[PDB]
């Protein structure tokens, strides 16, 4: 099988073992809201999780998709209830991590008590060791490789540069099949959140024009990885109604790269 040595079930089922290859835990908080299940399953085990709880990804691969069916429910006085299913995806770096939902059904608003078929992609937690805005490198620059990866495509490739001295970042996105996810990654300042993290919020472009937004934080101690996502705004057009309506699309794409080893001598 293609999933061999992909560490799927052993992640569901093995406690934290500090020997394995980090990040070893993804703490689980968009993922799953207060009071809600989700269950993950894959080759052959099951777990569930609440808000709070780790999952071990000490067990799975470095800089690929691991992918997990998932079930998302609810408790309600004894009865057990489905809210969504579909495929969820892990991207696993050394400091940081991200997941991600493809939606396959939803709970269905036209005729009550069903599951109705619906695809969407949207983007989880995003995880790992926040750098300290307050304690990152005081100049030079740092240039970072990894992917891009959005509904039914894992192949993006992300470039994303920052400029220590001048407190900002830029990049693009190529690679992506459909054409115009492949943006630029707009010049964007760091700036501290409410917990300090160092965070860099911005435009994405198109051919030269503002078609969205991204936003990524840097991980690691020694600021060795970026992670987070874009959203890319398509405008559609009536053609055939006297009446000129629009309507906006909102595509997700998952964001992860690090800087690479360089050749270097110890004299
Ligand atoms: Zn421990
Ligand atoms: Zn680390
Ligand atoms: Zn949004
Ligand atoms: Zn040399
Ligand atoms: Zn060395």
Known sequence: ??????????????????????????????????????????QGAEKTYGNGDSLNTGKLKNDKVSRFDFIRQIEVDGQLITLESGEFQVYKQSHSALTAFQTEQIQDSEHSGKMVAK???????????????????????????????????????????????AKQGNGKIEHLKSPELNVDLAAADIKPDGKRHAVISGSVLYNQAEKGSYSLGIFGGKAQEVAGSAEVKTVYYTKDTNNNLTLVGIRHIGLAAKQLEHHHHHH
């Open 119 to 165: 695809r969407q992609f949207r983007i989880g937690d995003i995880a790992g060791e926040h750098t300290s805005f307050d304690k990152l490198p005081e100049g030079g620059r740092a240039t970072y490789r990894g992917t891009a990866f959005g509904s039914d495509d894992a192949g993006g490739k992300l470039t994303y540069t920052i400029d220590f001295a």
């Open 1 to 42: 099988a293609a999933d061999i040595g992909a560490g799927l079930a052993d992640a569901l089922t093995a406690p934290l073992d500090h020997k394995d290859k980090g990040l070893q835990s993804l703490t689980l908080d968009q993922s799953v809201r207060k009071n809600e299940k989700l269950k993950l399953a894959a």
